[PDB]
Amino acid sequence: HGKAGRKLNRNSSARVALARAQATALLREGRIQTTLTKAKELRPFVEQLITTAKGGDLHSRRLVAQDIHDKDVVRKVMDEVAPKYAERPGGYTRILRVGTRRGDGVTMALIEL
Amino acid sequence: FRNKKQRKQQVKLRKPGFAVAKYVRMSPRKVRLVVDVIRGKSVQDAEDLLRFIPRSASEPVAKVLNSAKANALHNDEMLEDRLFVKEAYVDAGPTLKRLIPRARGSANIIKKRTSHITIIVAEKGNK
Amino acid sequence: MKRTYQPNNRKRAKTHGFRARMKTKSGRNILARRRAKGRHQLTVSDE
Amino acid sequence: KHPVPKKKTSKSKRDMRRSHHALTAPNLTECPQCHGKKLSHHICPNCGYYDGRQVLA
Amino acid sequence: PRAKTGIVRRRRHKKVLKRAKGFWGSRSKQYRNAFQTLLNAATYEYRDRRNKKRDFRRLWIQRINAGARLHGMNYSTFINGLKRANIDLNRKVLADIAAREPEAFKALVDASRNARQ
RNA sequence: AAAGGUGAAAAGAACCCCGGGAGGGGAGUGAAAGAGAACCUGAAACCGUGGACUUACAAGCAGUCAUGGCACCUUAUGCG
RNA sequence: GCGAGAGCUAACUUCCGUAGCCGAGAGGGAAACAACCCAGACCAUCAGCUAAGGUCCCUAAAUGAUCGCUCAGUGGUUAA
RNA sequence: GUAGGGGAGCGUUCAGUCCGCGGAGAAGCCAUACCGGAAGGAGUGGUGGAGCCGACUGAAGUGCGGAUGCCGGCAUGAGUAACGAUAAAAGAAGUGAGAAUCUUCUUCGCCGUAAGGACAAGGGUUCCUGGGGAAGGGUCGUCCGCCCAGGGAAAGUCGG
Ligand SMILES: [Mg+2]
Ligand SMILES: [Mg+2]
Ligand SMILES: [Mg+2]
Ligand SMILES: [Mg+2]
Ligand SMILES: [Mg+2]
Ligand SMILES: [Mg+2]
Ligand SMILES: [Mg+2]
Ligand SMILES: [Mg+2]
Ligand SMILES: [Mg+2]
Ligand SMILES: [Mg+2]
Ligand SMILES: [Mg+2]
Ligand SMILES: [Mg+2]
Ligand SMILES: [Mg+2]
Ligand SMILES: [Mg+2]
Ligand SMILES: [Mg+2]
Ligand SMILES: [Mg+2]
Ligand SMILES: [Mg+2]
Ligand SMILES: [Mg+2]
Ligand SMILES: [Mg+2]
Ligand SMILES: [Mg+2]
Ligand SMILES: [Mg+2]
Ligand SMILES: [Mg+2]
Ligand SMILES: [Mg+2]
Ligand SMILES: [Mg+2]
Ligand SMILES: [Mg+2]
Ligand SMILES: [Mg+2]
Ligand SMILES: [Mg+2]
Ligand SMILES: [Mg+2]
Ligand SMILES: [Mg+2]
Ligand SMILES: [Mg+2]
Ligand SMILES: [Mg+2]
Ligand SMILES: [Mg+2]
Ligand SMILES: [Mg+2]
Ligand SMILES: [Mg+2]
């Protein structure tokens, strides 16, 4: 069955609107607390977005401008963070499994830079 | 002794290691499910296991294990670093019945079971 | 769909009330034959 | 349509059904720093220690 | 004056439920199934009294048949030559002799055969 | 419609303990708290903890009746 | 079962007659089986003889005795 | 031995009467291997807390497994089905004993002749402030249209 991704019991338009707001904050604040899954969903998409931003050219900034809608944040990853990330080939994120919770009873996680 | 009345006069009941969650809003069988892991285990163990059992009835159950340990150490002058779960069980409370409407005209008695959760702590030594 | 009971204050009272229930013989009769059964609820006037 | 059960079931079977519902016990360990108890591969919840510190005390 | 059951029924009932033990499921615990189970149990008691009288007789028999055959005799022939020499032994006893008392059974055999020919 | 009962008397439980609580464990009152306010007895169905003897090649109205095993000994060491 | 009628010398058929049985009948036998063959259970017995029906093992009791038949598994399902 | 007729009795209450017991403990309940031909009835042990056994006689709402019986309780089905529109949610911040659900923030998604706004009929304090969390909430709740307390409604011209 070589397929690949998560449907995360949302549609497909949703799926995107999510990992775009989630990338938006992970970039907006170094780490986030969120479901372990939705995290292992947010890892390689933020990561790839790092590799777009890591480039300088105006293009890369409109390329980012598509997924990450807020200027301040764009500007942050473009100007501030991505450059900082120069000499490192990958692994711009990491994942931590905390524990449970009351209502849903689901495992939980911190995903950080 | 002679009379039952005389025994009543003389002795009094002391409850060693025992405490009771009365009238707790949770179904017996559920809560038993947590509690089946506590039983007969190093009482602190029970405090730990009950931090990582992810069921809802973890917490009222733990609450009653501190009560027991409490009552066992204080009220009964026991030995913390050798205290354990001699007994553990739960039985039914007065179950809490209310109506739910259903398809067409029909109705329904839906029962919100209560629980009498109860643990007895004790001293465990081999010789 | 739409239901039997669509309240109407003026209807309610002009239909079941007390001036109404006394206006007729069989309503006097309803009255005292209620009173005897110790109704607090004498009449929709008493709502 | 509308299948129901034929006969009331016994205490005996019924409790043979339950034969598995038995909860599995969190397999736990003690957490090199703060010293409460951590779940393997997760953060030791008291201090916040995965190897240095993360979530805070 | 009115007279509730008050007590009597619980009495009757317990009587049954105390007869009623060892019984598997509901049988040992609910009245109706209990008393019931016991109706049939009645049937089985009566018949099986006379019955065991049969069964034991069978048992004694097969043991004797054995005995006879252990030398060269048939049951029927042994027992018949033990009717012939008039040796009016119960057969329960004959089993006993046969299985717990060897050389005695031996002699009783030699006897039956003698009286047979 | 279903609805009744602490105690002799409120002497209705100051006060310490685990908990936000609920609830309980002491204490103290009482004769008794084996009456503590879900407060007289507390049957049965029904749910559980512990213990004895048992049960994973077996076919069953669940009993009967015969024998062996194991266990127990207050109308009870034999007809158990 | 024996007598007859209606039937198709069909029926777990129906309508009379007649004997027994079940109904209101347990017990043994016919594998199983209200009716059939033996037989009418006042209780007890770890006592004996028989009935119908049986006696290689299941399953009590002669793998009996002598004069034979069939070789077809007839026995263990029908006819011109 | 079925329908049926006959014979002798067991238990329940109320009643007359006698024997008589009971806070060193009544009835009722619980256990058991004793007795009687049976309905039944005794011994002892544990319960209970204030009434009761026995004999004789009288009178009955006088003995329940059934009636798809009536009332009530608790089981099965089952930790199953479902949690009430497929308009959709994320991260941070805060509070608390406890938060996926309550309060801020920044976004996202849906309605937009409505899923906005104003009336009438009906409802009746559901409005506002401060508080609470048993139960109502289809989960959770620190929250609420639920609980508590206190406030709020003003007409010569609107409406009668
Ligand atoms: Mg889902
Ligand atoms: Mg779309
Ligand atoms: Mg005292
Ligand atoms: Mg409706
Ligand atoms: Mg015989
Ligand atoms: Mg308290
Ligand atoms: Mg057991
Ligand atoms: Mg085999
Ligand atoms: Mg086996
Ligand atoms: Mg006919
Ligand atoms: Mg008849
Ligand atoms: Mg017969
Ligand atoms: Mg027969
Ligand atoms: Mg037979
Ligand atoms: Mg027949
Ligand atoms: Mg013969
Ligand atoms: Mg044989
Ligand atoms: Mg009297
Ligand atoms: Mg009385
Ligand atoms: Mg009934
Ligand atoms: Mg039916
Ligand atoms: Mg499941
Ligand atoms: Mg199912
Ligand atoms: Mg399923
Ligand atoms: Mg489902
Ligand atoms: Mg919904
Ligand atoms: Mg959804
Ligand atoms: Mg802020
Ligand atoms: Mg805080
Ligand atoms: Mg929500
Ligand atoms: Mg509107
Ligand atoms: Mg409000
Ligand atoms: Mg709730
Ligand atoms: Mg608060």
Q: Where are the domains of chain D?
A: 4-57
Please give the resolution of this entry in Å, rounded to 1 decimal: 3.0
**Cβ–Cβ < 8 Å for D43, D50:** yes
CA B1 from chain centre, in angstroms, equals 34
In our burial notation (b when 16+ CB lie closer than 10 A, e otherwise), range D6-25 reads eeeeeeeeeeeeeeeeeeee
Return the SS3 of E96.
helix
What range defines the domain where residue A28 resides?
A: 1-113
Q: CB burial class (10 A; 0-12, 13-18, 19+) of residue B56? A: middle
A-D C-beta contacts closer than 8 Å = 17
A5 — alpha (psi -120 to 50), left (phi > 0) or beta? left
Write out the two tokens for B98.
């209310």
The CB-based long-range contact list for E52-59 (8 Å cut-off, 24+ gap) reads: E56/E92, E57/E91, E59/E95
Question: According to the annotation, is D31 in a ligand binding site?
Answer: yes
- Neighbouring CB atoms inside 10 A of C5's CB total 5
In our burial notation (b when 16+ CB lie closer than 10 A, e otherwise), range E23-51 reads beebbeeeeeebbebbeeeeeeeeeeeee
**Cβ–Cβ < 8 Å for E34, E20:** yes
User: Gap from B120 CA to H48 C1', in Å?
Assistant: 28
- Which nucleotide's C1' sits nearest to the alpha carbon of E39? F63
Write out the two tokens for A82.
């991505």
Say which experimental method was used: X-ray
* Residues B17, B21, B23: CA angle, nearest 5 degrees: 155
Asked whether strand F has any atom less than 7 Å from the CB of B47, the reply is no
**Cβ–Cβ < 8 Å for B59, B122:** no
How far, in Å, from the CA of E51 to the mean position of ligand 14?
Answer: 13
Q: What is the CATH number of the domain that holds A54?
A: 3.90.1030.10
Q: CB burial class (10 A; 0-12, 13-18, 19+) of residue A97? A: middle
**Cβ–Cβ < 8 Å for A34, A26:** no
- Please count the structural domains in chain E: 1
- Neighbouring CB atoms inside 10 A of E52's CB total 10
**Rounded to the nearest 5°, which phi and psi values hold at D39?**
-80, 130
- Please count the structural domains in chain A: 1
Map out the domains of chain B with their CATH numbers.
Answer: 1-127 (3.90.470.10)
Q: What is the dihedral of CA A75, A76, A77, A79, to 10 degrees?
A: 70
Question: According to the annotation, is D2 in a ligand binding site?
Answer: no
How far, in Å, from the CA of E92 to the mean position of ligand 14?
Answer: 26
Write out the two tokens for E45.
């008691």
Q: Do chains D and A touch (3 or more CB pairs under 8 A)?
A: yes
Whether domain C1-47 has CATH 3.40.50.300: the reply is: no
Q: Which residues face E70 on adjacent strands?
A: none
- Neighbouring CB atoms inside 10 A of A41's CB total 20
Q: CB burial class (10 A; 0-12, 13-18, 19+) of residue B106? A: exposed
**Cβ–Cβ < 8 Å for B57, B26:** yes
User: Gap from A73 CA to H105 C1', in Å?
Assistant: 16
How far, in Å, from the CA of A9 to the mean position of ligand 24?
Answer: 20
Sequence-separated (6 or more) residues with CB below 8 Å from residue E78: E64, E67, E68, E108, E109, E112, E113
Question: Which residues 74-93 of A interface with strand H at a CB distance below 7 A?
Answer: none
Q: Which residues face D24 on adjacent strands?
A: none
Listed residue (A111, A82, A83) closest to A96, CA to CA: A111
Instruction: Tell which strand G nucleotides have any atom below 7 Å from a protein Cβ.
Output: 26-28, 43-49, 55, 60-63
Sequence-separated (6 or more) residues with CB below 8 Å from residue A77: A27, A49, A50, A53, A64, A68
Listed residue (E52, E54, E53, E20) closest to E39, CA to CA: E20
**Rounded to the nearest 5°, which phi and psi values hold at B21?**
-70, 105
Dist. CA C36–CA C39, nearest whole Å:
7
User: Gap from E34 CA to H62 C1', in Å?
Assistant: 26
